Structures are given as C-alpha cells and as structure tokens.
Amino acid sequence: VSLDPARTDRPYLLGRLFAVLEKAQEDAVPGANATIKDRYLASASANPGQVFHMLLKNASNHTAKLRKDPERKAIHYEIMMQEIIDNISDFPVTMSSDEQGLFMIGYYHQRKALFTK
C-alpha cells in the first residue's frame, strides 16, 4: 500500500497538489522558520477554492524567479502541477469531514515519494 498515480479522486489529487507545492516552496526559499504546511494545512482542507487560488500566485512568482539561475528540479514540478491541475475539474468550496480524511492520505502518500531521492 503506497502512492497510487491513478486514484483520480478529487480530494486525493488535492492532497498530492498540496504536498508538491510544499516541496517546491521548500527549494524556493531555504531557511524559513515555518513552512506553508504549518501555516495553511488546516485551511486548505476546509476551504479548497479559497486558498488554492491564492497559493498558485506565489508559486507562479517563484517559478518566474527561478528560471534565471541555471538550476532546475523546477520544470519537473511545473509538469507535476500541470498534470494534477488538468485532472482536477474544479475546486470545491468545501469538503465533507469523512472527504477531509482522504485528503490527508493523498498528501502523505505523495510526500513519501518526494521524500525519496
């Protein structure tokens, strides 16, 4: 039992997306006291459409920044975003509690994978 690239359930996809935004941010800005996780974990799971919209602004800004320097990862992450955001039809305003459980699994699963290598 591990990460399934084919689950195609919306709250699972949202969890994966969250996890990889965390990872990309990490590489963006070293040395931060607090991660986006610590800041937004709860909110994200309660109000998808609310926040998700917001975060992508900053992510855009960052990837804009990061092309100057020769270093890359971040093109793999931009592709990973672009896959998950194409599979997600739309952003729910809110999720049933039981669904907020499944969101945690997609996050953890995805994280572990990225934890490797």
* Nearest alpha-carbon partner for 44 in 90, 115, 4, 93: 93
Least CB distance to other proteins at residue 88 (A): 18
- The residue whose two tokens read 């499944």 is 102
The option from its own copies, other proteins, none interacting with 26 (CB < 5 to 8 A, set by class) reads none
Distance CA 69, CA 1 (A): 39
Q: Which is nearer to other proteins, 29 or 85 (CB)?
A: 29
Tokens of 104: 């945690």
* CB-based contact 113:20 (threshold 8 Å): no
Q: Which is nearer to other proteins, 13 or 28 (CB)?
A: 28
The option from other proteins, its own copies, none interacting with 6 (CB < 5 to 8 A, set by class) reads none
* Piece in contact with its own copies (CB under 8 A), picked from 14-22, 23-31, 32-40, 69-77: 32-40
Residue type, 16: R
Q: Check the chain for breaks (C–N over 2.5 Å) and list the residue before each, or none.
A: 73, 98
- Interface ranges with its own copies (CB under 8 A): 1-2, 33-34, 37-38, 41-42, 45, 49-50, 52-54, 56-57, 60, 64, 68, 81-82, 85-91, 93, 97-98, 100-105, 108-109, 111-112, 115
